[PDB]
Every structure is written in structure tokens, then in C-alpha cells.
Write an enzyme that holds these catalytic residues in place. Structure first.
Site, PDB file in Angstrom:
ATOM      1  CD  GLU A 198       7.128  -6.221   3.695  1.00 56.41           C
ATOM      2  OE1 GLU A 198       6.756  -5.175   4.270  1.00 56.41           O
ATOM      3  OE2 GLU A 198       6.402  -6.875   2.920  1.00 56.41           O
ATOM      4  CG  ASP A 222       0.830  -9.460  -1.814  1.00 57.84           C
ATOM      5  OD1 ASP A 222       1.769 -10.068  -1.255  1.00 57.84           O
ATOM      6  OD2 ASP A 222       0.950  -8.292  -2.241  1.00 57.84           O
ATOM      7  CG  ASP A 252       1.553  -6.708   2.435  1.00 58.19           C
ATOM      8  OD1 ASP A 252       0.658  -6.283   1.676  1.00 58.19           O
ATOM      9  OD2 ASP A 252       2.767  -6.520   2.215  1.00 58.19           O
ATOM     10  CD  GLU A 294       4.354 -10.078   1.851  1.00 56.05           C
ATOM     11  OE1 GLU A 294       4.414  -8.858   2.107  1.00 56.05           O
ATOM     12  OE2 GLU A 294       4.023 -10.540   0.751  1.00 56.05           O
ATOM     13  CG  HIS A 351       2.759   2.392   1.870  1.00 52.51           C
ATOM     14  ND1 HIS A 351       1.864   1.353   1.758  1.00 52.51           N
ATOM     15  CD2 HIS A 351       3.985   1.860   1.644  1.00 52.51           C
ATOM     16  CE1 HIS A 351       2.518   0.232   1.512  1.00 52.51           C
ATOM     17  NE2 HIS A 351       3.807   0.510   1.440  1.00 52.51           N
ATOM     18  CG  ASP A 397      -1.230   3.331   1.296  1.00 54.16           C
ATOM     19  OD1 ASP A 397      -1.135   3.257   0.048  1.00 54.16           O
ATOM     20  OD2 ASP A 397      -0.688   2.521   2.078  1.00 54.16           O
ATOM     21  CG  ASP A 410       4.372 -10.320  -3.508  1.00 55.95           C
ATOM     22  OD1 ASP A 410       4.192  -9.105  -3.266  1.00 55.95           O
ATOM     23  OD2 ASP A 410       4.257 -11.196  -2.631  1.00 55.95           O
ATOM     24  CE  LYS A 469       7.687  -8.865  -3.899  1.00 54.21           C
ATOM     25  NZ  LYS A 469       6.796  -7.873  -4.565  1.00 54.21           N
ATOM     26  CG  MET A 495       4.225  -1.216  10.620  1.00 54.63           C
ATOM     27  SD  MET A 495       3.830  -0.899   8.887  1.00 54.63           S
ATOM     28  CE  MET A 495       3.227  -2.513   8.399  1.00 54.63           C
ATOM     29  CG  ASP A 555       3.805  -7.733   6.063  1.00 53.58           C
ATOM     30  OD1 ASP A 555       3.505  -7.112   7.108  1.00 53.58           O
ATOM     31  OD2 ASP A 555       4.193  -7.182   5.009  1.00 53.58           O
ATOM     32  CG  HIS A 558       7.706 -10.742   0.231  1.00 53.13           C
ATOM     33  ND1 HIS A 558       7.858  -9.448   0.681  1.00 53.13           N
ATOM     34  CD2 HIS A 558       6.669 -10.715  -0.644  1.00 53.13           C
ATOM     35  CE1 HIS A 558       6.950  -8.674   0.114  1.00 53.13           C
ATOM     36  NE2 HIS A 558       6.210  -9.419  -0.689  1.00 53.13           N
TER      37      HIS A 558
HETATM   38 MG   LIG Z   1       2.553   2.157  -0.330  1.00 50.29          MG
HETATM   39 MG   LIG Z   2       4.491  -6.961   2.940  1.00 52.04          MG
END
Ligand SMILES: [Mg+2]
Ligand SMILES: [Mg+2]
Ligand SMILES: [Mg+2]
Ligand SMILES: [Mg+2]
Ligand SMILES: [Mg+2]
Ligand SMILES: [Mg+2]
Ligand SMILES: [Mg+2]
Ligand SMILES: [Mg+2]
Ligand SMILES: [Mg+2]
Ligand SMILES: [Mg+2]
Ligand SMILES: [Mg+2]
Ligand SMILES: [Mg+2]
Lengths: 387, 387, 387, 387
Positions: free
Chosen positions: D180, D256, D286, D216, D53, D56, D254, D182, D87, D244, D219
Site C-alpha cells: 500500500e 480518509d 479504508d 488507496e 491489523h 486491532d 491523509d 503513501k 485481507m 482501498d 494516498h
Molecule cells: Mg493497524
Molecule cells: Mg489504506
């Protein structure tokens, strides 16, 4: 219309209206509330009292001098409003030391610390007049199978609750404990995940009479369970010491919506049950005003909690008092459900040919239960769509 | 490789391999099986025995003469194969008379009939050597809130189980009862919906020692619960009298897939727990070969049940015996989890400054739990991807 | 009060009020209904019409002579009541030949039969005046991963729907197709499991304009989805050709409760959306009167479907017409949501310093959304608890 | 054994191994990672690259001078390791300004800001060589019904994606977009909640060829859906632009988890599908190393992601190459599933008496599908329990 007063026994956690709006993916949207302001604003809305985690009232790591000042200000706000503190609890989940649990942490020294932290706050809870001390073991559990031997963990959990019972007994305290179940989040699976698992665990404690449950609407619904049914079993066992009211839309993360939101009909049947059974404890809201809201929305959401309880109380009472509903209940044999199956005893049942050899199973099977008409009368009453 | 023998204690319900494939939307895809053929074919696969509902073995409404002949043929097949009957149960859910339940039907005369039907089959179960009598209250519950007062229903349920305990005591029978929980289906919500609710209910029975649970993999997973965790709590309570093994893909209708299908890793952790705890009861499969299958697929699916248990038994044993895993378990402080938190007692804990005043909470919090490395060793062992 | 009339466009499947009560664990509790009686009784309740599977109206395996007589009697009942038939569908799921699907069965000869069976009933549907032909692919899917290559299955599914579109085009029929999604049951996973998957699939058909969706309340809720949200996306795409109304309590087996039962607030928001959008199709109920009920309960449950729709229609209209609600909608910036984000175009947006370089992100973040007050006004309106 | 190399195309978000462990109920358990260290450590594990992101890589609110220095250091770490950036994505969910969404916020000025923030990071993504730009609309949705008109919101969402497509076209960029999905969390319901809803939405965009999905694992499983099935539909549509990989235990928050954890058999069928279809994009993880872990556990969890993919790749390839499996696939008519249903055309099908008038429906229904034997061969291959 539907205006709450302190006699309605509505209570709120400091962490509820005080939630700043941090979620797994987002920063705070509201500034921190002074507990004194929450007490004042909740009293203005007609609340009966508040509840707290130790760390909601006294910031973690406070000196004794700071601790005394935080409690003194809080007590002055309670005194100035008439607000009570019927319940308190320990934060055994926020600090990183509790990342694998408090009472069932794999590290023994963390388990000992968890007990010392809890005992310190039991003393304060008694000081502030609380009748119930809640335990929510949010960190007790696992994300993986090898990480937690559950039989060992349940041994450690029984040890912790037994020590706490020994402590309150030794001090002559009248406070009782209530375990708050949750099936998951923040751990992948949480120990004692439902009302049933908590009730069963309590029966293995050394002093079972000191422990009950604090069920939460949304938590049983995170397992897809019928919350009114679980409350009924808790009442049947004599263990509904306290209750958390909120809303939840099915099986997902713990939403903590205001009460009445989420499953509206389950909220109706819940209020019908609490009032019919004569539940006398706090009507406590464990909810989070959505982080979309400013402080005006916080207080609107808290007000809606109490309003929805009072509307549902009215409609459930009207349902039960309606002679047409009482007739429908008889048509559906709810009166027969309340009668003993075999008060004549086992031998009389074995000798009763009408119970087997001469039982007309086809005639019984043909009797409609009339449940749908009964349920539509319930729907009409909930919606104010009767006469 | 992985060939079952009768000493592995694998058992199957007559209703499992005998399921004709009728589902809510479809007619049968397989012809009915004679119980004698199921006994023969299961013995050829290495099974230990079978279980039955009364109505699986003796068609509903049979005369005494027909009843005697059905049992006589069944006993001859058992005698000719060495197969046992460790468990039996009552069908209190198929016949329309049970549409609102058996033990908790609103109609009192139906509740009395349910007890008479059960008692008749307890006698037969004892005759055939069964050690456990299972109760699955599939019709006990409701689709709507007014239809079932759950406190009254739990009174009726306790009455029924108490009468059954009085009966077996009066007859000198050594059989014990096991309640099989299910959260829903075919009722919208079923009473005693999880292992926890059943365990808690048993503690209120007059003779609690006579009752345990018969948990089913898929049923706890229909509530999104961790089945190994629930089995651990049942073992902790001394109440795992029997178990149903199968597969389920999460929160949906009751799939009854063969064991090992559905949640494979939960099956691994389940077998690891049963073997580590020394569970000595039947490894019973309550499953349905999918209706896509012909009879060859029926027996392949039954064979897969036993094969998957034996593969998982091998991999779990290899996991626990691996010195690298034992080191990882120590690194994750599973040894500390097994040690009492405060065997020194409450006063010593209160006086221990290392438990609070001098506890370095930051140093403890920094200790990684090393759970992910432990879990990847578990994954490697499950997949046979170690050295 | 809340009395339906045929102009309300309420319709019912023959299989709904005609459900005999067979479920996975139980035999029928009601006798079969003659379609003529269902038409008569539904007309007396104020229904607009009925729908049918081929095999609901003409028993499977009927001769041409029997087929003609069944249709003739049915048409006479329609003529005698003014009832319509706005929708028909094919049973591609009950007969054992369809155990692995119709259009996507692995066996090619079954896929060809499924198409011939469907085409025969399309002709009959047009004869009876139906405007929509629904496809519910309840058997299309799998219990295991190797059994169904989903890309191949989607090829076969596109082939089938394309052939059906070629057929109706070649005949000059004005009927359109609607795919009814369901995520699971009776298959472990069903293809095109949600409104979204069906909408996406349609865009790959040769004549996409001929196909829309027939979403069902309970089916999207079996995936935990927001049914009003999915209907909104279907309307946004211009594809809400038909709708199934019923009730469902969360993620479990397909309950098919009467409309208004299950998630009451989602029913409110659904009716609010259908009426605001001007949905002009049938208000069709795909529901099952619980098998606890006799025929009187069947008709009470059907009547409740229509009553609950009309109550919710009243309350949603009152909500939207309330000036205090319109003010709250403005306070929550629902008016801004309806305005284009950048009608000034991309370059103007890139050059707009108020959109980035000079955007006061803190002042925007501080603006409360006022959603909780808006939602409590919605709750008050639903419950008739305003002034 | 099972050692990843950069040619395996494994990639990781900076936010994955860099997750400090803050969850809804707990503070961070790990210190922040410098992106440079994550690049170095991931390269040492055999990763191919990283994703980010905007926020990030460049802390929110950075000056241009600080922004340039953060990117310069990051590029040096990429250059020193050979790591790629396939990506990138925008954080439109952490900052409080996005509390009601980015592209579909009710406030128009927030929607414009969301687009400007995204466009700025598209430029940077292209600079760093990214081929896919992901959009996860985590804040797009609602907790209540009146707060969000979904048709208006979908208009705003289409507007935003159309503007972004206009932008990349105007700049001559070769990057493509991936949505993406969710279903929920952090909003009570999220717009475009599944792969299907996203695929359907894309077909209404002005330049549909520029947009695909980034599904994902966890998700789709939060909606109880079959993730391999959804990937198959995405591949069938030509829209699997990115993926993902992670783990999830059913319908809950979620999680992960690392890939291979959660639903192990779904992970097997997923890898089987990606490899059989020749998916050529990044194998992106992810995931979040559980907050129980220290940094050593972080890297062990990341290593396990890649190891589990490679083990499953081996077992799936062995399954498909096994002549006994190929025979079972033929026995189950997977070869027939791949053949056109009616390449002879509609008229030939209508004239084919073997498709209806002379179709032996009973003989077809009696053919077992042999799916259980096929699935047990798949289980044996997954577990390395063949010969
Ligand atoms: Mg982010
Ligand atoms: Mg994801
Ligand atoms: Mg707290
Ligand atoms: Mg005692
Ligand atoms: Mg709570
Ligand atoms: Mg049975
Ligand atoms: Mg006793
Ligand atoms: Mg069972
Ligand atoms: Mg049908
Ligand atoms: Mg066209
Ligand atoms: Mg339907
Ligand atoms: Mg184009």
C-alpha cells in the site's frame, strides 16, 4: 560560534520541547516533561522565555488548589532562570467538547464555554507578564459543506473576539491579541486559513487596534504560499504582533520541523526581512522535535532552532552590507521600486506624454532586470561562498 | 432541460472562447476569433454578455482610427444581439514591458505607463456600460527574494489603486474596482495571492468602498483553499463585486477548465452559497476550452459552463428545500450557529455558571454532530439519488 | 572559486539558454539565439556540451538542404569549442498535430508520424555522438476521463518504445533511451507521471535493458515527492541513465529555475547522493532563465547552475569526510541499516528468540535515533558554519 | 434504492468504523468498539466482510490464552453473520519501537522483530481465510537526509519481502502480498511513495508474482496524482490485488473521508474503470468517520461509502451503454486508440510514406478531438441530467 543569549529573544512553547511524540498513527515515544525542567533546560541553551497553553501548565480539570501549586512552581523556575513568558494561548482543540470548534462551534453552550476558558487564561497570562495572547482556531472549520455556514461562523468569530477585546479593555490590561492562521489540519478546512484572511477579518472587529497576526512558517507553506511575502504584508499593515518560526517541506501535513529545516532559502529571506524591518517581538519557535528523538535529541533540535536563526542573521546582514550587492540592487532598480510612482499627482500623470504617448515601450522592455545575478550573490552569501 | 437565457446573467471573456490554444509548450491549435463572431455565437448559446481586456478588443499599438473602428463593430454586434459588457480589465501582463509587473514594476516609468494604459481603458469600459473594472496583477511578484521588496511593492500598489479611485471619482464614474487574486503563475509568487490578502489590502486604500474582489475558482484552489469558504468571507465583508467561474484539479498550473469540471462538489457548494446569499452580479466564466478542441468543441465547452451552473442551482435548491435536510440541519445545530453567542453581554457571560463552573463538558462532548448524514443527503441531492 | 571545466560534465539544452521567454500569459522578451552562439557562450562558461530537440536545431519543415546546413554549422561550433552532444530528444509536443499526444495520440496516423519523426532524429543523435536519447511525453495524457483509456494508451506507449528498441538494435546503435517523467503540464495529467511509474513501465518492455529514466528535479517536486529519494530508487534499479538538474518551489507550474534555486537542501542531498553513488553521466541542466532577464542574465543564470553544483559538491564531501559526522552516522545506526537483516536465513530467524519471544521492545523503543544532531551537522556543513 | 448486499464485496477495516477519533491535536471522541459489534453492525448494513491489523484484533502484548479468546469470539461473530476476512495486515507503525520503521528501521534487531511480528499474523490471516496480506510501510522513510540511506533501505525492504515470500512458499500458503503506497505522513517522506514506485520495486523481488499493490484513493491524491490513471497502470501490469476506497480533498494530511467524498468525479472514473476492467477483488474502505460523529454517524458514514459506490456504478454503466456516448467515443477516436500503431511492423512503418514524407500534418492538426462534448455527456450521466 552562533551562541544564543537571552537578549536574542528566543522563546519556545511548553508544548514544543514537551511534545511526547504522539502522532495520528503512533503512541508517545518520550515521557512527559515537567514544565519546570523545560524552563531550566531552555535557559541553559540561551533561551529568553517560554509560552504556554492553559492546559500545558495546569492539567485540564485541576482544582483551584492544584492550579495554584502548578503556577507557583512554574513561577519559581522562571525566577530562578530569568526566563520570561511573553505570550500565552488557550487550548480550544484537544478536549472532545471542542470537536466542532470553540468560538465557532455549532453548539452555543460550547461557544460560551470557550470564551470563559479563554478569559480565565487571559488573567493568568497578564499575571505572568505576557504581552501577546494568541488564538489558533484549529477546530474552527469543517470537513463538509453543510456542516458550517461560514458567514454565520464569521459572525460568531467576530462576536468572540469583540467580547475578548471588551474584556481586556474593561480590566485595563495592556495585552494584545494575535490570530494564528492555518489552512487545514485537524479540520478539513480551517476558517481564516492564511495571513491574508486573518488580516482582513481583523479590520471588521470593533477595536481593530487590539488584534494582529501570529503567522507560522509551516502554516502558510501548507497553502504553498511565500511566507516572507506574507510577513511583509503583515508588517505593511502594522500587524506582526508575534511570529512562529519552524520548518515545513511544502504542501502536506503540518510538520513543525525545527527552524531552518524545510525551506532553507525562505528561512534566509524571512530573517533578512525581520531584521531589516526591525521586528522587535519574540523569535518564537512552534516546533516538534521528531518522535525519533530521545531527550538529548529534543535539546539538540531546540538548540538548532536558535543556531539556524543566528547563522541566517549573519549571512543576511553580510548580503545587505556588501557593496557589490548594493550595486546589484541598483542595477535591478530596487531603488526605483521605493520611489513614489506619481508624487506629481493624477493630473500631472495624465498630462505627462512620457508616460504614454511618447513612452518607448520597446526600449523599456529590452532593459534586463538583472535579477539572476542578484539572486546568485544572495546564494553565495547564504552559503558563505563569496570571496 | 437546463437551457440558459440572458436573464441568468452568464458572461464570458473574449479571451476565453477566443483562446487560440498557445500554452508554455505548444503553438496555437485554433485560428483567432473576431470579437464580433464570439458575441454572436455566445448570444446564440444564451449568454448575457462579454468582458474584455483592452488588448482583446483593440490590438496593441492601434491607431485612433483603427481603435474607433474596432469598437464600432463590437458595439454593433452588441446592439444586434442584446448582449451587455458588465466588466472590463487591462492587459498588464502580455507585453514584454510588463515582465516585472505593471503597478509594481521596479521601473518607475513602467508603473506610470501601466496607470495610463489602465485609465484609457476605464474610459472605454464606462462607455460600454461596465459596472466593474477588474485588476489581475499577474506580473506583480517575483521569482527570487532580492528582486522585490514587498513592502515597497505594496506601497506602489496602494498608490496605483488610490490614483485610479481618484480618477473615477474626479470623472463622476459609477464603476467600481475588483481585484482578482492568484497565488502564482506566471510569476513564481504573485502579490495579493488569495482572497484574504486582497480583502486585507483593500482596507488600507484611501477609498475602500470603491474596491472589492473578483475571486476565481481555480486560483484559490491553486493554493489548496476552499473556494466556497473564501467566497463566504468575501460576502461577509460586502466585497463580492464580481466572480470568475471555472474548474481546476487541485494544486498545479492554472487549468481554467469549464465550470463544473475539476472539483464538482466545490462547484455545488459554491452555487448553493451564491444563490442563498442572493449574489446579483454576473456569473462570469474565465475558462479556456482545451486546445484539443476545434471551434465546435469551443462552443460545447462554453455551453457546458452554463449547463453545469443551472444543474447545480437546481440540486442545491432541492437540497435546501427538502424537509428532511432542514431536519438534519437542525440535528447538526446549524440553527444554533446562527444565534448570537452572548447577546446577554460580557458581564452576564462572566456571571453565568452554566458557561463554566457548572458546564457539563462531557455531556456536550458526547453529542454527535450528525454531519455525515447531512453530507450524504447533500450527496444524494447532487447526484439526483433521493426518492 | 568554484570554476567549472568541461571535465565536470555540465551540459545544457539548446532550449534552455535559448528560451525566448514566452509563457502562457506573455510574449517573448528575448530574441532567438543561434545554436552556434549558445555553443560558443556555454563553452566560454566551462560547459562540457549541449543537448537538443530535433526542432531546436533544425526548424520544423526544413528541406534536406537546409537541414544539412544547420547541422554543418552546429558541428563546426562543436569542433571549434570541444563541446559534446551527449543526449538528444524529439519535440513531440509543440506542433498542433501533437495536441493529444505523439506515441499515445488517439489518432493512429499521428502515432505513426511521431515514431517516424523520432527515428529520423535518433539517426542524427547517433551521428553527433549522443549516448542517451530522451523521451518526454509531455502531451501523453488527458484533461478529462473519457478522452483517454489509459490501459490502451499504455499498450500504445509500449508498442512505440518497443519499435524504437527494435530500430536501434537493427541498426547496431549503442544509444540507450531515457524516459523523463512529469506529473502534469501541459496535459491535465501526464502518463508515467513520476520516476516510479516510468521505472515500472520499463519492466514491461520487450528489451528492458535499453531503457532507463531521465528524472528532473522540478518534475518530481511538482508531485511533492522527495527527489533524492526517487534518484536513489532509480540508482537502486540501475536505471539512472541521465538526469535533469534545475530548481522548483513546491507544487505549482513547472518553474525550471536554475539549479540550486528552489529547494536548496534537496539540491544538497541530491549532489551528495550523485557523488557518493559515482554517477558518471552528464550533469544536465533543463532550466529557463527567467524572462525578466536579458542575455547577460541568461549567461549569469547558466553560470549559477554550475557554480551551485560545485559548491554543494564541496559541502557534501566535507560532510561525509568529517569524523564528527561519521561518528553521528554510527550513533544513528546508519551502519546497521547497511547490514543484512537476516543473512542467517528464514529458519534461523524463526528460531531466534531474541527476534520475538525475548526481544525487549521497550529498551529498543527508548533508544533515540539522534537524527536531529546529525541533521544539524549537515546544516552546518551546507552553510559553512562548522569550525 | 442502492442497497448493498454481501455479493457486492464491500469490506471495512476494523480500524475504520472503530476509529476512536484521536488526531494529532485531539483526544478520542468515541469509545472503543468491540470487534464483535463492528462485525455485527457492518453485516446489518450489507457488508461482505472485514479486515484487520494484528493489533486491532488482539491487543498488543496479549498472552496466548488471551489471544486465543479474542480470535474465538471474532470467529463466532463471523460465523453468525456470514462475514468474511479477505485481507489482513500488520501494525508496524503504532508502537514506539517502530519509530524509525519496521522492515527498514536503522536498528537491525527492530527489523528482525518486524518480520517475526508479520509472520505470526500471516499464519492467523491464512487461518481466517484471507487471500491478500497488505503491507503499509507508514514508518519507512525519514524527516531528514542523513537519517536514511535509501539504497540501503531498499535493500532491507527487498530482503524483508523476499523472506516473507520464502515463508509463504515454504508453508504452501495461497495468500499473496499487496504493498500500500503513501507519499508521506507520518514520516516526512515515505519510501515507495506512489503506485508507480511500488510496482517498480516489486519487479526486483525474487518472486515478483507473489506481490501486487493495494492503492488507496487518498494516498495517490496526496501527491496530486490521478488515482484512476494509477489504477489503470496497476491493472495494465496485472498487479491490482486489492484496493482501498475513500475520499481526499487534494494535497494535505491523509483525510480518509468516506468514499465518494473528496474528489467526486475521480470516484466516478474510478468505479467506471474497476467495473469495465472486471476487477474481482474486495471493494475495501479504508476510511475514518470524522471525529465530530457519534456511533450513529459512524454507521451512516459507512453506509454512505457503499451507497456512493453503487450510485457511481449505475451512472458509469449508463454512460458506457448510452449510444450517444458510444458515438462520441468514436468521434474522439477512442476506437483508434485501441488499435495497434504498427502491426505491419517496423520496416513497413519506415517504408510508409503516409507516415512521414506524405503525412498532411496540418489536416491532422485541424481535427478537433471532441473531448469537451464527451466530457459533458459524462457529467450529465454522473448528475442524472440526461433526458
Ligand atoms: Mg493497524
Ligand atoms: Mg489504506
Ligand atoms: Mg495547547
Ligand atoms: Mg477602534
Ligand atoms: Mg504555531
Ligand atoms: Mg488580457
Ligand atoms: Mg472612504
Ligand atoms: Mg480570472
Ligand atoms: Mg523541444
Ligand atoms: Mg531483454
Ligand atoms: Mg527536463
Ligand atoms: Mg518468480
Amino acid at each position: 560560534n552562533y551562541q544564543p543569549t537571552p537578549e536574542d529573544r528566543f522563546t519556545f512553547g511548553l508544548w514544543t520541547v514537551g511534545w511526547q511524540g504522539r502522532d495520528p498513527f503512533g503512541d508517545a515515544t518520550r515521557r512527559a516533561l515537567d514544565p519546570v525542567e523545560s524552563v531550566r533546560r531552555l535557559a541553559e541553551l540561551g533561551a529568553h522565555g517560554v509560552t504556554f497553553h492553559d492546559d500545558d501548565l495546569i492539567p485540564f480539570g485541576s482544582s483551584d488548589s492544584e492550579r495554584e501549586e502548578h503556577v507557583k512552581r512554574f513561577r519559581q523556575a522562571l525566577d530562578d532562570t530569568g526566563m520570561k513568558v511573553p505570550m500565552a494561548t488557550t487550548n480550544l482543540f484537544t478536549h472532545p467538547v471542542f470537536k466542532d470548534g470553540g468560538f465557532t462551534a455549532n453548539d452555543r453552550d460550547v461557544r460560551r464555554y470557550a470564551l470563559r476558558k479563554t478569559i480565565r487564561n487571559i488573567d493568568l497570562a497578564v499575571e505572568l507578564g505576557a504581552e501577546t495572547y494568541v488564538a489558533w482556531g484549529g477546530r474552527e472549520g469543517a470537513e463538509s459543506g453543510g456542516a458550517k455556514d461560514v458567514r454565520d461562523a464569521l459572525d460568531r468569530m467576530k462576536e468572540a473576539f469583540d467580547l475578548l477585546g471588551e474584556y481586556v479593555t474593561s480590566q485595563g490590561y495592556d495585552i494584545r491579541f494575535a490570530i494564528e492562521p492555518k489552512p487545514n489540519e485537524p479540520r478539513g478546512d480551517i476558517l481564516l486559513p492564511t495571513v491574508g484572511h486573518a488580516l482582513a477579518f481583523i479590520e471588521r472587529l470593533e477595536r481593530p487596534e487590539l488584534y494582529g497576526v501570529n503567522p507560522e512558517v509551516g502554516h502558510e507553506q501548507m497553502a504553498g504560499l511565500n511566507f516572507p511575502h506574507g510577513i511583509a504584508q503583515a508588517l505593511w499593515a502594522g500587524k506582526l504582533f508575534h511570529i512562529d518560526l519552524n520548518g515545513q517541506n511544502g504542501i502536506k501535513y503540518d510538520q513543525d520541523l525545527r527552524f531552518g529545516a524545510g525551506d532553507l532559502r525562505a528561512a534566509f529571506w524571512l530573517v533578512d526581512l525581520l531584521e531589516s524591518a526591525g521586528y522587535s517581538g519574540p523569535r518564537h519557535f512552534d516546533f516538534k522535535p521528531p518522535r525519533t528523538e530521545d531527550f538529548d535529541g529534543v535539546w539538540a533540535s531546540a538548540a538548532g532552532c536558535m543556531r539556524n536563526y543566528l547563522i541566517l542573521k549573519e549571512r543576511a546582514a553580510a548580503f545587505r552590507a556588501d557593496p557589490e550587492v548594493q550595486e546589484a540592487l541598483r542595477a535591478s532598480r530596487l531603488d526605483e521600486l521605493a520611489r513614489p510612482t506619481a508624487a506629481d499627482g493624477l493630473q500631472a500623470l495624465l498630462d505627462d506624454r512620457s508616460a504614454f504617448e511618447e513612452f518607448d515601450v520597446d526600449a523599456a522592455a529590452a532593459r534586463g532586470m538583472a535579477f539572476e545575478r542578484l539572486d546568485q550573490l544572495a546564494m553565495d552569501h547564504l552559503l558563505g561562498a563569496r570571496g
